[PDB]
Amino acid sequence: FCGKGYHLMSFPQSAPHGVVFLHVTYVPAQEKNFTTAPAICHDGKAHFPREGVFVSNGTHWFVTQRNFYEPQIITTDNTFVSGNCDVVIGIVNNTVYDPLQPELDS
Amino acid sequence: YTMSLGVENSVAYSNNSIAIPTNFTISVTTEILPVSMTKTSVDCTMYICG
Amino acid sequence: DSTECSNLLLQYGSFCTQLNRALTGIAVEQDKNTQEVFAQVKQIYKTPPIKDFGGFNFSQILPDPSKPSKRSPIEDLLFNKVTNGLTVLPPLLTDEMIAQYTSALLAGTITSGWTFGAGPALQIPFPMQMAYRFNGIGVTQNVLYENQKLIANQFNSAIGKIQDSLSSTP
Ligand SMILES: *[C@@H]1O[C@H](CO)[C@@H](O[C@@H]2O[C@H](CO)[C@@H](O)[C@H](O)[C@H]2NC(C)=O)[C@H](O)[C@H]1NC(C)=O
Ligand SMILES: *[C@@H]1O[C@H](CO)[C@@H](O[C@@H]2O[C@H](CO)[C@@H](O)[C@H](O)[C@H]2NC(C)=O)[C@H](O)[C@H]1NC(C)=O
Ligand SMILES: *[C@@H]1O[C@H](CO)[C@@H](O[C@@H]2O[C@H](CO)[C@@H](O)[C@H](O)[C@H]2NC(C)=O)[C@H](O)[C@H]1NC(C)=O
Ligand SMILES: *[C@@H]1O[C@H](CO)[C@@H](O[C@@H]2O[C@H](CO)[C@@H](O)[C@H](O)[C@H]2NC(C)=O)[C@H](O)[C@H]1NC(C)=O
Ligand SMILES: *[C@@H]1O[C@H](CO)[C@@H](O[C@@H]2O[C@H](CO)[C@@H](O)[C@H](O)[C@H]2NC(C)=O)[C@H](O)[C@H]1NC(C)=O
Ligand SMILES: *[C@@H]1O[C@H](CO)[C@@H](O)[C@H](O)[C@H]1NC(C)=O
Secondary structure, three states: OOOOOOOEEEEEEEEEEEEEEEEEEEEOOOOEEEEEOEEEEEEOOOEEEEOOOEOOOOOEEEOOOOOOOEEOEEEEEEEOOOOOOOOOOOOOOOEEEEOOHHHHHH | OOOOOOOEEEOOOOEEEEEEEEEEEEEEEEEEEEEOOOOOOOOHHHHHOO | OOOOHHHHHHHHOOHHHHHHHHHHHHHHHHHHHHHHHHHOOOOOOOOOOOOOOOOOOOOOOOOOOOOOOOHHHHHHHHHHHOOOOOOOOOOOOOOOHHHHHHHHHHHHHHHHHOOOOOOOOOOOOOOHHHHHHHHOOOOOOOHHHHHHHHHHHHHHHHHHHHHHHHHOOO
């Protein structure tokens, strides 16, 4: 409706008997392949991303936002637990880091 | 000639692979929309008869 | 073919030019309408040969290889169910090219979700795409993943009911 791509903002310009809209949009570019999974199996529990998506560069699993590649460590703060690992089709095994663990470790 | 609808592109679909963007382009596009016309009035009596 | 009639018709001026111009404007407007509706993608996307979409069946909407027209069964049913100086101009886009445009749109929305409409087509598994759509309407991803077989069965049943309803309603 407001240009090709993900619309950010627009500018109006007057024209003789008309209007010209300059649509400023966000276009994704330089995409890269990753191996993906619906959920992460850890401690008999299924972990799902709160806002992102699980990606793998070949050896390590990360969670990133969907429209830009920004890999982050899969923790309990960006994932939520629902059910066990027996129901989700395509769940893979990976560890889930806990930020609270070094606090009581020390 | 018979027209070509578009450049051919086969998306590499598989059940466990995703494509994630690593960069972006800020694209500005133009959209021209007419708003008004010339306001014309015709004297019907003068036009038909003068 | 009457010369006298045309000679008398020339006394009325450029009425014929106005009518021909208006009809020409309508005729080009129809082609512009078809371009605006169907020609919104410049890439012709194609489905993978293996139709492994996590239980989702798209055979009723994807083009049938057995048919020479390369139409879907639903599109084939739709085409079956629709039946002195005048000329009919052919449309600029033929039915097979319009079907090809719809096939490209279907392949893009199945293999890439909404990514192809906003830029380059980014591949994503179809259950993950459905989970994204579930998050769009405010339902968590887990609900989609846990009940994926049920959702696929419901979707296939609904598509079959659509084909039956179109075939059974005049
Ligand atoms: C995937 O990315 C991770 C994180 O960038 C890579 O892990 C790093 O690999 C380098 C190169 O050997 C090491 O020096 C770092 O110490 C690693 N970091 C961690 C936290 O282990 C990983 O190697 C990448 N995998 C592939 C296949 O490229
Ligand atoms: C992911 O981890 C689970 C849990 O350990 C694995 O499930 C086990 O699989 C072995 C062999 O198939 C069985 O003998 C165990 O009884 C299973 N345990 C449970 C709790 O189900 C699963 O196979 C692992 N998957 C991968 C790909 O490594
Ligand atoms: C992700 O991987 C797929 C396949 O591993 C790549 O698809 C191939 O792209 C090349 C380059 O044009 C084609 O010649 C092949 O025919 C494609 N294969 C298939 C099966 O379609 C894809 O390009 C990769 N994506 C990125 C961003 O590198
Ligand atoms: C993302 O893309 C931008 C441009 O779209 C890249 O910026 C260019 O970077 C090269 C090399 O660093 C420069 O020679 C160009 O002049 C830059 N262009 C502009 C407009 O600044 C940027 O480096 C890309 N980033 C990644 C990570 O690929
Ligand atoms: C997808 O749906 C189609 C249509 O419902 C299935 O095709 C049917 O397959 C069965 C057994 O193979 C036949 O008895 C039916 O006559 C077929 N129907 C039609 C309309 O051809 C197809 O098997 C389903 N699954 C896949 C993976 O394509
Ligand atoms: C993808 O399909 C293969 C079979 O071709 C299967 O072994 C694998 O588990 C599937 N992965 C997912 C995530 O569904």
